[PDB]
């Protein structure tokens, strides 16, 4: 799995929840619709199939 | 409601129709009752209503 990092920028996570192409969108440890108004250290976005 | 759409009515539960359609409450005391409807509901050249 491909690992890209996320750092020192800022996050639009509205978009992705709101789009509907993405069959499932669960959290752990956070509700995505307040997601947008946190601030983190860093993100680390892991991608695979 | 639209089909994998049913497990957001649900007490807790985020998504689309759960925050911005029907939100029930956390206490929610009582029970949901789903049945697929594809025979009066669905219409050839679709039903928009």
Do not use: H, M
Not at chain 2, 4 to 14: F, L, N, Y
Not at chain 2, 21 to 39: M, R
Request: aromatic share 14%; charged share 20%.
């Amino acid at each position: 799995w491909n690992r890209k990092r996320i750092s020192n920028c800022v996050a639009d996570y509205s978009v992705l929840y709101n789009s509907a192409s993405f069959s499932t969108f669960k959290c752990y440890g956070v509700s995505p619709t307040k997601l947008n108004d946190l601030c983190f250290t860093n993100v680390y976005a892991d991608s695979f199939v | 409601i639209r089909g994998d759409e049913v497990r957001q009515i649900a007490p807790g539960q985020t998504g689309k129709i759960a925050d911005y359609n029907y939100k029930l409450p956390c206490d929610f005391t009582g029970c949901v009752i789903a049945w697929n409807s594809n025979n009066l509901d669905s219409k050839v050249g679709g039903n928009y209503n």
